[PDB]
Design a protein around this nucleic acid. Structure first.
Ligand code: MG
Ligand code: MG
Ligand code: MG
Ligand code: MG
Ligand code: MG
Ligand code: MG
Ligand code: MG
Ligand code: MG
Ligand code: MG
Ligand code: MG
Ligand code: MG
Ligand code: MG
Ligand code: MG
Ligand code: MG
Ligand code: MG
Ligand code: MG
Ligand code: MG
Ligand code: MG
Ligand code: MG
Ligand code: MG
Ligand code: MG
Ligand code: MG
Ligand code: MG
Ligand code: MG
Ligand code: MG
Ligand code: MG
Ligand code: MG
Ligand code: MG
Ligand code: MG
Ligand code: MG
Ligand code: MG
Ligand code: MG
Ligand code: MG
Ligand code: MG
Ligand code: MG
Ligand code: MG
Ligand code: MG
Ligand code: MG
Ligand code: MG
Ligand code: MG
Ligand code: MG
Ligand code: MG
Ligand code: MG
Ligand code: MG
Ligand code: MG
Ligand code: MG
Ligand code: MG
Ligand code: MG
Ligand code: MG
Ligand code: MG
Ligand code: MG
Ligand code: MG
Ligand code: MG
Ligand code: MG
Ligand code: MG
Ligand code: MG
Ligand code: MG
Ligand code: MG
Ligand code: MG
Ligand code: MG
Ligand code: MG
Ligand code: MG
Ligand code: MG
Ligand code: MG
Ligand code: MG
Ligand code: MG
Ligand code: MG
Ligand code: MG
Ligand code: MG
Ligand code: MG
Ligand code: MG
Ligand code: MG
Ligand code: MG
Ligand code: MG
Ligand code: MG
Ligand code: MG
Ligand code: MG
Ligand code: MG
Ligand code: MG
Ligand code: MG
Ligand code: MG
Ligand code: MG
Ligand code: MG
Ligand code: MG
Ligand code: MG
Ligand code: MG
Ligand code: MG
Ligand code: MG
Ligand code: MG
Ligand code: MG
Ligand code: MG
Ligand code: MG
Ligand code: MG
Ligand code: MG
Ligand code: MG
Ligand code: MG
Ligand code: MG
Ligand code: MG
Ligand code: MG
Ligand code: MG
Ligand code: MG
Ligand code: MG
Ligand code: MG
Ligand code: MG
Ligand code: MG
Ligand code: MG
Ligand code: MG
Ligand code: MG
Ligand code: MG
Ligand code: MG
Ligand code: MG
Ligand code: MG
Ligand code: MG
Ligand code: MG
Ligand code: MG
Ligand code: MG
Ligand code: MG
Ligand code: MG
Ligand code: MG
Ligand code: MG
Ligand code: MG
Ligand code: MG
Ligand code: MG
Lengths: 48, 125, 50, 110, 100, 115, 154
RNA sequence: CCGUGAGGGAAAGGUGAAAAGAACCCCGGGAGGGGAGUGAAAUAGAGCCUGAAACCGUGGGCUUCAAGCAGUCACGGCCCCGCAAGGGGUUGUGGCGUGCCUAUUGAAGCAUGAGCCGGCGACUCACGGUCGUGGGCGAGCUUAAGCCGUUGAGGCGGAGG
RNA sequence: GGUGGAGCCUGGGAGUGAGGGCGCGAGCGAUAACGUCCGCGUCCGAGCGCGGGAACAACCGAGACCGCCAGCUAAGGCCCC
RNA sequence: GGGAUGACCCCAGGCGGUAGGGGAGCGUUCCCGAUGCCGAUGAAGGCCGACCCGCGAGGGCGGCUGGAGGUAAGGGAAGUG
């Protein structure tokens, strides 16, 4: 029982693991009434 | 005194008939041609060797009882996954691949070996 | 004479054996004691005169 | 001409906040402001505060024209970590590292 | 017009005005050297028996060098055996003046 | 007097790590993996020095053998030629000839068949 | 490890902890443990044979005399030793303080007068020794105290 | 701090010549920073001399249908430094190549030990012996304790061995 | 005859006292064992340094001071890899 | 052998190696040398280097950092790698 990692994982193999971990910026649309940026299909923070 | 080493040569092309020439005797030759060991500027790491075209495969002959008795094998990844294909059934279904396989097994292994094999185009007829 | 050139004779200091420093330099790892056994052990052997 | 802000000893883990800093690098200050607002991570609150301190630094200290600012460079280094005991089963006692970031936004004019 | 000469148990291809590095030979810098009577010409009929008698190559001793140091290290595992030795190999530099 | 380590070990370690510049992962960053990698790099260089000589000859030969096969003979007879004709020039390095100076090489084929 | 401050207690059980095996933290392998073969107070002295010290004294004056750097003198007219007084006589003596001088005399007033010169080391007669002869470029005695230097050798 | 108790038992030093320890302004809830100022120096700014290594990061150059103890030998490409045949970086392809230590008849070994870095870490000293060696004196050699002197001065002392 | 990292004498310092494979001669074993126990050789040990044997301590070749992009060979090889 | 009675030139050989013996050296702390000498026109220590000397351990030399120490030749002693 109790598995365990057999070798310290190298810097390259953990950073390769992380090749998917990056964020994607929020998808935003200009607000028709106000000037500002709003995420679509949601109610405008300014000028509801 | 450094030893001579070329700059990019332009690749020659070559045509062979193969009807009646036997199989490995012919394969030997395609191999040294593909490698480029006839050219007296041969270098091991470059791939300056004649592109070889071969027509009239399927007309390679072979000695002894090898048409019934010479078997080709293919292992898949799986249990029971060893396929055994005898020479005659090959020629009947895929003539060349019988010359391709004879030559592929005679070029060196590795990335450059695998590139030279691309430079050998084998046809039937 | 002066203190700069006082200097003992070419025999006469000879300046000793540092066992157990590097390989190569001979004496090394095992301090000229060989492999195991009572004689290699720290308090060593049992008075060989008797 | 460039203007920089550095938030030092921010009580957040580098790997976490480094993720949103990656989100706004080489972006104009205007989009960066939009991105941190609508990016859902604790770390955008902090990156934002540094942007803004750095923008203000651009204007009130270096004559840099806010409407031309972009994030030329940015990076979060890792400050000293707060080590805290974590008691486990069978008397065991691990240590968790509450880690710490030095966030740094660096602005230029485009 | 070229030749093929022999200095230091080696055989180099000389042309006039060609500097070349050679196993060290005993000759003052600036002194002149008649390179043992070479074994080929570049108008080509002249081959023969080991050496073509009569024709020489004359080269001027530029000076005596020491090549870049080479680290010769030996290591034998599980035996505590390592040796380190630096070796840089003496040479003399020559310029090919004329083919005689 | 007491003579503590002071500065001696850090310099020794730096000496090695400089040699190990360029090596993969820890072999260039850890004094121990550095030293272990060096051990091998040292015997390899000494060995491949010895076999650069072999490696280079083998190349000259394939080229010699190639050129004079255009002139219808072996390598192995070709060499018997020059052994007989006293032409211990070739010093196979000068298959330089076989490429740059063909008709000087040709003159040596014909010099060779006369045995 | 015997004289360091800590307990004799065995630090861990010795089997089944998964750690190395240890006794008391006094052990010299531990940081802050005891020293191994470090210095204890010891007496570096030894009885060099008397004839060798006797000879070496003679031999060391000799080497000085062989160079003509030995000089014997009388009475200095520099008594009531003030260094400025000695500095005057030492000029009639050709000692311009250009070479270290060793001055042997049993005359407290004259020693007292030279002491503070950087280039002079002073010494009663019965205190002659090779070490001081050798570090000083010139040797200067009076005729007493060369009397005893003579009666000491042989 | 641990232990009921006897008892165990740590870590932890350094701004600057001088606090002159950064008024004031700016962003910020503060923290922190940016200017301003002090200073010979502010990556000497108080988490403060120097500030190594492991470790983490940003930027740049070279580099990605092959398979491996990671290197090494050759050539070629790209990048850099130079007057030059020159050199530094990187690695495409080709040749070669079974980690270090330990213990063993024998280990890459699927036998021990080691996550990595830094620092601490093991042939000593006394008194005898026995050889060698450098000197002293030699049918002789030599003093111990002590006494005097000196305060990094030596002498004397013949019991004794 | 043989001047050899030969020999002999005195003395200082060791380490070793788990050997292994192979050949040949025996015993034990089953005219078994990568078995075991002796003898004479050898090699590995310590030559897991080099070439050959696909790979491989001890089989064949050969005793690696350093360097060379020179030459002759040994065993083994010379259709292509 | 050279007759410089040598510190080197010429000639011939030897120079795999574990236990282990012997021999030369490098470097670290401290002492005499030092009331000296290097040091703010920058000590020690750090970071570089494709440069010089050394078989090697190492020593130089340049640049950067650092900001108050360091310590020749020749010898002595050790908590010396
Ligand atoms: Mg000893
Ligand atoms: Mg050793
Ligand atoms: Mg030894
Ligand atoms: Mg040894
Ligand atoms: Mg011993
Ligand atoms: Mg022993
Ligand atoms: Mg012993
Ligand atoms: Mg042991
Ligand atoms: Mg044993
Ligand atoms: Mg023993
Ligand atoms: Mg014994
Ligand atoms: Mg014992
Ligand atoms: Mg004990
Ligand atoms: Mg829990
Ligand atoms: Mg509990
Ligand atoms: Mg952890
Ligand atoms: Mg090995
Ligand atoms: Mg072994
Ligand atoms: Mg070893
Ligand atoms: Mg220490
Ligand atoms: Mg130490
Ligand atoms: Mg130490
Ligand atoms: Mg060879
Ligand atoms: Mg105790
Ligand atoms: Mg105690
Ligand atoms: Mg206590
Ligand atoms: Mg107890
Ligand atoms: Mg365990
Ligand atoms: Mg402690
Ligand atoms: Mg202590
Ligand atoms: Mg003085
Ligand atoms: Mg309690
Ligand atoms: Mg309590
Ligand atoms: Mg101060
Ligand atoms: Mg202070
Ligand atoms: Mg103070
Ligand atoms: Mg509040
Ligand atoms: Mg100022
Ligand atoms: Mg200043
Ligand atoms: Mg600094
Ligand atoms: Mg500072
Ligand atoms: Mg700190
Ligand atoms: Mg200070
Ligand atoms: Mg200071
Ligand atoms: Mg600091
Ligand atoms: Mg990068
Ligand atoms: Mg590709
Ligand atoms: Mg490779
Ligand atoms: Mg071990
Ligand atoms: Mg073991
Ligand atoms: Mg064991
Ligand atoms: Mg065992
Ligand atoms: Mg066993
Ligand atoms: Mg075993
Ligand atoms: Mg493994
Ligand atoms: Mg084992
Ligand atoms: Mg086990
Ligand atoms: Mg293991
Ligand atoms: Mg072990
Ligand atoms: Mg064990
Ligand atoms: Mg450990
Ligand atoms: Mg460890
Ligand atoms: Mg460690
Ligand atoms: Mg360590
Ligand atoms: Mg001892
Ligand atoms: Mg001892
Ligand atoms: Mg003794
Ligand atoms: Mg003794
Ligand atoms: Mg004695
Ligand atoms: Mg011998
Ligand atoms: Mg012998
Ligand atoms: Mg013998
Ligand atoms: Mg004997
Ligand atoms: Mg001994
Ligand atoms: Mg003995
Ligand atoms: Mg011994
Ligand atoms: Mg013994
Ligand atoms: Mg014995
Ligand atoms: Mg036995
Ligand atoms: Mg046994
Ligand atoms: Mg037995
Ligand atoms: Mg045996
Ligand atoms: Mg035996
Ligand atoms: Mg036996
Ligand atoms: Mg037989
Ligand atoms: Mg057996
Ligand atoms: Mg048997
Ligand atoms: Mg045997
Ligand atoms: Mg053994
Ligand atoms: Mg052997
Ligand atoms: Mg042997
Ligand atoms: Mg072998
Ligand atoms: Mg093996
Ligand atoms: Mg082999
Ligand atoms: Mg083999
Ligand atoms: Mg030999
Ligand atoms: Mg030899
Ligand atoms: Mg043969
Ligand atoms: Mg020789
Ligand atoms: Mg040897
Ligand atoms: Mg010896
Ligand atoms: Mg020894
Ligand atoms: Mg100290
Ligand atoms: Mg000091
Ligand atoms: Mg001065
Ligand atoms: Mg100044
Ligand atoms: Mg200056
Ligand atoms: Mg400076
Ligand atoms: Mg110091
Ligand atoms: Mg320094
Ligand atoms: Mg410095
Ligand atoms: Mg250096
Ligand atoms: Mg400098
Ligand atoms: Mg320097
Ligand atoms: Mg410096
Ligand atoms: Mg400065
Ligand atoms: Mg100061
Ligand atoms: Mg020093
Ligand atoms: Mg000093
Ligand atoms: Mg000193
Ligand atoms: Mg000295
Ligand atoms: Mg010294
Ligand atoms: Mg110690």
């Amino acid at each position: 029982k109790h598995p365990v990692p057999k070798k310290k994982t190298s810097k390259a193999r953990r950073d390769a693991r992380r090749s998917h971990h990056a964020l994607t910026p929020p998808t935003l649309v200009p607000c028709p009434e106000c000037k500002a940026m709003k995420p679509p299909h949601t109610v405008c923070p300014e000028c509801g | 005194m450094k030893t001579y080493v070329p700059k990019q040569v332009e690749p020659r092309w070559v045509l062979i008939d193969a009807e009646g020439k036997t199989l490995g005797r012919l394969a030997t030759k395609i191999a040294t041609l593909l490698r480029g060991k006839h050219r007296p500027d041969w270098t091991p790491n470059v791939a300056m060797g004649d592109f070889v075209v071969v027509v009239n495969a399927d007309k390679i002959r072979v000695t002894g009882k090898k048409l019934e008795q010479k078997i080709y094998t293919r292992y898949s990844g799986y249990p029971g996954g060893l396929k055994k294909i005898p020479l005659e059934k090959m020629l009947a279904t895929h003539p060349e691949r019988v010359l391709e396989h004879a030559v592929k097994g005679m070029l060196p292994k590795g990335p450059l070996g695998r590139r030279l094999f691309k430079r050998l185009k084998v046809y039937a007829g | 004479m002066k203190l700069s050139d006082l200097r003992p004779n070419p025999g006469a200091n000879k300046r000793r054996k540092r066992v157990g420093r590097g390989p190569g330099s001979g004496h090394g790892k095992t301090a000229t004691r060989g492999h195991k056994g009572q004689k290699s052990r720290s308090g060593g052997l049992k008075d060989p005169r008797r | 001409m460039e203007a920089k802000a550095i938030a030092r000893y921010v009580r957040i883990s580098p790997r976490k906040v480094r993720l949103v800093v990656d989100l706004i690098r080489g972006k104009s200050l205007e989009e960066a402001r939009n991105i941190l607002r609508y990016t859902n991570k604790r770390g955008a609150y902090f990156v934002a505060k540094v942007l803004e301190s750095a923008a203000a630094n651009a204007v009130n200290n270096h004559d840099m024209l806010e409407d031309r600012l972009y994030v030329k460079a940015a990076y979060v280094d890792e400050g000293p970590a707060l080590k805290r005991v974590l008691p486990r089963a069978r008397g065991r006692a691990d240590i968790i590292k509450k880690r710490t970031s030095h966030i740094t936004v660096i602005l230029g004019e485009k | 017009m070229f030749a093929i000469v022999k200095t230091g148990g080696k055989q180099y291809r000389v042309e006039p005005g060609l500097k070349l590095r050679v196993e060290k030979l005993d000759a003052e810098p600036g002194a002149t050297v008649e390179l043992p009577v070479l074994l080929l010409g570049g108008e080509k009929t002249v081959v023969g028996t080991p050496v073509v008698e009569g024709a020489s190559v004359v080269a001027e001793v530029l000076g005596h060098g020491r090549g870049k140091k080479i680290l010769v290290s030996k290591f034998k595992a599980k035996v505590q055996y390592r040796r380190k030795k630096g070796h840089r190999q003496p040479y003399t530099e020559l310029l090919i003046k004329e083919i005689r | 007097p007491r003579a503590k380590t002071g500065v001696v070990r850090r310099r020794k370690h730096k000496k090695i790590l400089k040699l190990a510049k360029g090596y993969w992962g820890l072999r260039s960053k850890s004094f121990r993996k550095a030293r272990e990698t060096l051990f091998a790099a040292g015997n390899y260089a000494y060995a491949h020095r010895k076999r650069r000589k072999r490696d280079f000859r083998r190349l000259w030969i394939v080229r010699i053998n190639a050129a004079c096969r255009q002139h219808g003979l072996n390598y192995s007879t070709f060499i018997h030629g020059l052994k007989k004709a006293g032409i211990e020039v070739d010093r196979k390095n000068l298959a330089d000839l076989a490429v740059r100076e063909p008709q000087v090489f040709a003159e040596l084929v014909e010099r060779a068949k006369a045995a | 490890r015997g004289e360091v401050a800590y307990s004799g207690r065995k630090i861990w059980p010795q089997k089944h902890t998964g750690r190395a095996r240890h006794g008391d933290i006094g052990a010299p392998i531990f940081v802050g443990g005891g020293v191994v073969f470090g210095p204890k107070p010891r007496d570096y002295s030894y009885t060099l044979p008397k004839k060798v010290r006797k000879k070496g004294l003679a031999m060391a004056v000799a080497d000085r005399a062989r160079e003509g750097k030995l000089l014997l003198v009388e009475a200095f007219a520099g008594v009531n030793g003030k260094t400025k007084e000695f500095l005057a006589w030492a000029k009639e003596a050709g000692l311009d303080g250009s070479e270290s001088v060793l001055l042997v005399t049993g005359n407290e007033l004259v020693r007292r007068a030279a002491r503070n010169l950087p280039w002079v080391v002073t010494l009663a007669p019965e205190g002659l020794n090779v070490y001081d002869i050798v570090r000083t470029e010139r040797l200067v005695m009076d005729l007493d105290a060369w009397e005893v230097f003579q009666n000491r050798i042989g």
